[PDB]
Amino acid sequence: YEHVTVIPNTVGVPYKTLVNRPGYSPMVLEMELLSVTLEPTLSLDYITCEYKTVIPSPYVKCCGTAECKDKSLPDYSCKVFTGVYPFMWGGAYCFCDTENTQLSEAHVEKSESCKTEFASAYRAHTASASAKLRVLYQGNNVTVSAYANGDHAVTVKDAKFIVGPMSSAWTPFDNKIVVYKGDVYNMDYPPFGAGRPGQFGDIQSRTPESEDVYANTQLVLQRPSAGTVHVPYSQAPSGFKYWLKERGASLQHTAPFGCQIATNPVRAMNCAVGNMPISIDIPDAAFTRVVDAPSLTDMSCEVPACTHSSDFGGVAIIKYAASKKGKCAVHSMTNAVTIREAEIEVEGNSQLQISFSTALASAEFRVQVCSTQVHCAAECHPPKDHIVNYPAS
Amino acid sequence: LSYRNMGEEPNYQEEWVTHKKEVIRTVPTEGLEVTWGNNEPYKYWPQL
């Protein structure tokens, strides 16, 4: 009626499930999760871009005493250079002799590429589970994607799906992550506007489109240009340049758990940890009765080759004699060997040479031939290959 | 080019490469994903 099982939550596993209704016929379903999605609760705190110090117009009081100004901006500064004797391209800038002053006023400013400057200090909240899995039941292999927590239905081919939650949260979420313009960098977000000198976060933007920005980078004006109209204004290095310079590894560079990291929104594709509770709401009317199918009996299970490898190494014949022709299910009634097919066409007194992938060398695989049992034997020798690409059985 | 194990402890080593190189990747229990340059990196899984 309802088949609740746990598939091994891994990318690309042929998750076989034998829905055998008692007094129905044998039913089998082969589903595989293509992608799981970890979607965290992003909560932006620091806005990260390089801070550009806007130096003002030169306050050359030529032949005149300097006056103070309280530049109450982010990093405003007024400095008095006594001895204002600047000369310019039209000549000497002061017609007065020696009593000129240089008021040097320098303020801070955000990045003019601040739209391109995407430093997102997403203080991460909880994670969301989304999953897309294909399913092959009723002779049909079709995909279904959903918010994979188990609080929203999937319904495909008359088959309900309660997918999710996962087992654990060891995922690519850190505590307060940083979107470094496409990158996931797990970082220590500083005091929001009260950041330390020169680190990643010198110009902290408490709003990503805000107007207040904490920038204490030591933008200090030196003594002025000696006879030249120049405001020497020494500031700290590019902390946004440094954190972009020291970008480090991304999520793909930092994949724990075999994790695959994606951005905007940060998606945890291939969170290879935990098993998936999948509940197929089987529509029971499609479940054909036990008298309905061909009556498979008098079978022999002969392992033609036993090669303990990742591939379907035990390819064994089942000389079976069905009651009538039809598509009878091949169910892995044993624990180890996965049947390469799912339901083979049994036409009559013939041999179905189906393959099973296992690892155990002395293999006795018990299989259900649509109602029947067969415990076949195989000496699974070690395969000659060393390293493969895929996963195995 | 970086390498890292295919499980929880990745151990994601990485080296910028300049010359001809012979990388001796260790077959992990979860295998070894290596991205050498700009393609999707190969994931070694050792058959017994």
UniProtKB/TrEMBL annotation, chain B:
It comes from the Viruses. It is found in: Host Golgi apparatus, Host trans-Golgi network; Host cell membrane; Host cytoplasm; Host endoplasmic reticulum. Homodimer. Homomultimer. Interacts with host karyopherin KPNA4; this interaction allows the nuclear import of the viral capsid protein. Interacts with spike glycoprotein E2. Interacts with host IRAK1; the interaction leads to inhibition of IRAK1-dependent signaling. Provides the signal sequence for the translocation of the precursor of protein E3/E2 to the host endoplasmic reticulum. Furin-cleaved E3 remains associated with spike glycoprotein E1 and mediates pH protection of the latter during the transport via the secretory pathway. After virion release from the host cell, the assembly protein E3 is gradually released in the extracellular space. Acts as a viroporin that participates in virus glycoprotein processing and transport to the plasma membrane, cell permeabilization and budding of viral particles. Disrupts the calcium homeostasis of the cell, probably at the endoplasmic reticulum level. This leads to cytoplasmic calcium elevation. Because of its lipophilic properties, the 6K protein is postulated to influence the selection of lipids that interact with the transmembrane domains of the glycoproteins, which, in turn, affects the deformability of the bilayer required for the extreme curvature that occurs as budding proceeds. This is Structural polyprotein.
